[PDB]
Curated annotation (Swiss-Prot), chain B:
Top-level EC class: hydrolase
Binding site for Mg(2+) 2: 13
Reported effect, residue 25 to R: Reduces ubiquitination
Record family assignment: Belongs to the exonuclease superfamily. TREX family.
Protein name: Three-prime repair exonuclease 1
Active-site feature positions: 173 (proton donor/acceptor)
Covered range of the whole protein: 6 to 234 of 314
UniProt-reported outcome of changing residue 13 to N: In CHBL1 and AGS1; autosomal dominant form; loss of 3'-to-5' DNA exonuclease activity; abolished ability to degrade micronuclear DNA and restrict activation of innate immune response
Length: 211, 212
């Protein structure tokens, strides 16, 4: 029954129409799959590993983004429609599973403040498609829980500024935040990995944000 | 029968075990889908569009990479195995089609020197899975042919970039670094590039497999 060491860490981030109290919809997602050997056996800001699998997608949310969401993320439902983006459908979930199936198991999703935002919204989106157990293979970790354990604001920018004395590029974009998260997790890569291996939680224990 | 204007330009690049004369196998691929409005209505080097779909994957090739291929791409079959990479299989073909199905049609693949490398290698890999017609719906353009026509001299990705932005592009000879540099080059005269693509896009079914 216990999984043993996580073989892949899938660094994850999403943008939405708003915050959880508004019942948000995904507008953007980024998945960055990194094998555990890139963290246990790595070769001021560490370079990302040469071998990674990346997936960044924009999603039509079916409703307006709050004006706050648009200012911070640079996305709006109207601009997403101008770009011919499709909604969060069966093909999108099939795409996500196909990408994850290319990674050796056990898989662990890693998201900054993932337990309150990215993980329940991903669960809510899948549940709305009648696929409530689609990603139940996966494990998940909140990198805030992880980085507090390894050591005040625990925001992505604050943690980044304290370790590498600079602001990260392309902030508040799903891909930019995933790349910033990776660099933060590469600060003490063996320590971060041991914690993940011991505290990875089954994705099925994540309740959907709504519905 | 006329497809009309291309709605998406999918900037494409691949790394392989070696050059065509060795019957190579894909080791890495990058797809960057840009809606046509990003080039027809844009807002030194131009920034990439805010809204893009990107897929970058590494692939277990089934055989050794040539020492030349490893020196240039930074990839080897042993290192791909240590990172637990899967081969080009049915799941990889469904992943590519699901990614392309998120893009409005007509789709057009854009690869630098694509006719000789990227496009026949992709057809060869799809044919080896018994999926010869999998991407017949798509169109393709070789950006070397497009940029020669736009400038009408070395026409390598590096040389074009240096002639346009007076600097060398970062992460050269990685599928993503090269897709991004090509995107920058195509954003130089985006309206003229888009007008040419619309007039000379060719159906992907006209691309024969490199081998097989
Ligand atoms: C106390 C702060 C520091 C919370 C911070 C935040 O408010 N930042 C500004 C902002 C960004 C985007 C939008 Cl849209 C807005 Cl309005 C405001 N947040 C919430 C937003 C979500 C992104 C949107 C979202 C909402 C619900 C579910 C999934 C995703 N991020 C994802 C990250 N991994 C963890 C979280 C975060 O840091
Ligand atoms: C005459 C020159 C200028 C060709 C140039 C080249 O020799 N560069 C060095 C090199 C890179 C990688 C490897 Cl592996 C080696 Cl050994 C050598 N090439 C071929 C390599 C392929 C990359 C691998 C490949 C091989 C067969 C089919 C698909 C892809 N590229 C992809 C690009 N879109 C167009 C082409 C390119 O410019
Ligand atoms: K974010
Ligand atoms: K290349």
């Amino acid at each position: 029954l216990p999984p043993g060491p996580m073989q892949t860490l899938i660094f994850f981030d999403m943008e939405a129409t708003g915050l959880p109290f508004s019942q948000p919809k995904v507008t953007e997602l980024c998945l960055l799959a990194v094998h555990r050997c890139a963290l246990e056996s790595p070769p001021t800001v560490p370079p990302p590993p040469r071998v990674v699998d990346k997936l960044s997608l924009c999603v039509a949310p079916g409703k307006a983004c709050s004006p706050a969401a648009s200012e911070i993320t640079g996305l709006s439902t109207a601009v997403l429609a101008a770009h011919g983006r499709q909604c969060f459908d069966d093909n999108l979930a099939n795409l996500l599973l196909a990408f994850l199936r290319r990674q050796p198991q056990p898989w662990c999703l890693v998201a900054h403040n993932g337990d309150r935002y990215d993980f329940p919204l991903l669960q809510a989106e899948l549940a709305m498609l009648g696929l409530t157990s689609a990603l139940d293979g996966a494990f998940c970790v909140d990198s805030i829980t992880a980085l507090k354990a390894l050591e005040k604001s625990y925001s992505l920018g604050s943690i980044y500024t304290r370790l590498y004395g600079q602001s990260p590029p392309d902030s508040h974009t799903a891909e930019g935040d995933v790349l910033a998260l990776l660099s933060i997790c590469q600060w003490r890569p063996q320590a971060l990995l041991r914690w993940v291996d011991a505290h990875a939680r089954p994705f099925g224990t994540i309740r959907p944000m709504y519905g």
